[PDB]
Amino acid sequence: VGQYLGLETREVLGVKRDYLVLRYKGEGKLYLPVEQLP
Amino acid sequence: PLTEIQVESYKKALQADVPPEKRENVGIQAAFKETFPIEEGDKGKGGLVLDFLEYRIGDPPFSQDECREKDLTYQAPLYARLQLIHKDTGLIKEDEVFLGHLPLMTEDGSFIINGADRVIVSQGGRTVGELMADQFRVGLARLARGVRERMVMGSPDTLTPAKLVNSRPLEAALREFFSRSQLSQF
Known part of the structure; x- marks a missing residue:
């Protein structure tokens, strides 16, 4: 079960990157980059 | 005053x-x-x-x-918002991680530990606030180390801020600072 918490423009490693923001129920807040395929 | x-x-x-x-x-x-x-x-x-x-x-x-x-x-509990960056992928993993309980200082210098009114005398020249902060740095430096080690001998993919972080070394360092605090005579 992954809950989709929307897209978000976070800056990491010294600058921007958008990620698909998911909270897996069970807990982690996983940020998944749009640049990757899945 | 001093207090x-x-x-x-x-x-x-x-x-x-x-x-x-x-x-x-x-x-x-x-x-x-x-x-x-x-x-x-x-x-x-x-x-x-x-x-x-x-x-x-x-x-x-x-x-x-x-x-x-x-x-x-x-005492109030201490949490840290940690974040694991896979640069191999870009993937990020946030987590609020528990780092233990900090004693709070009452209005007159004393801490209250298990009912008892206990004091950290500064003998002196580095106040109680920086004395703790200094010892905090040491703990963290040790905790910073459990992580570096796990990263080396775990599979990056299954690793996450909470797994890398072990608070024990931070706490051991605090326990020892507040451990040798003394009882008050007001």
Whole structure:
């Protein structure tokens, strides 16, 4: 079960990157980059 | 006076009711911001970067009165918002991680530990606030080390801020600082 918490423009490693923001129920807040395929 | 100098001192070392970005580079904040980020490149692509975002000090569950009657310790819990960057992928993993209980300092210098009114004498020349912050740095430096080690001998993919972080070394370091605190005679 992954809950989709929307897209978000976070800056990491010294600058921007958008990620698909998911909270897996069970807990982690996983940020998944749009640049990757899945 | 001294209590008033000393109280505020500890109170600025924690910045406990100060919003995270209105926080000065002092005590813990420095300790955290300086000791973090922990990177293991070492694998040609990636390994991980673990960065610090903020720390949360809980607010006290028992008041000083409650604490001296019910024989309890007067302490707020400490959490850190940690974040694991896979540069191999870009993937990020946030987590608020529990780093233990910080004793709060009552209005007259004393801490309340298990009902008892205990004092950390500064003998002196480095106030109680910086004495703690200094020892905090050491703990964190050790904790910073459990992570560096796990990164090396775990599968990056199954690793996450909570798994890398072991608080024991931070706590051991605190226990010892507040362990040899003495009982008060007011």
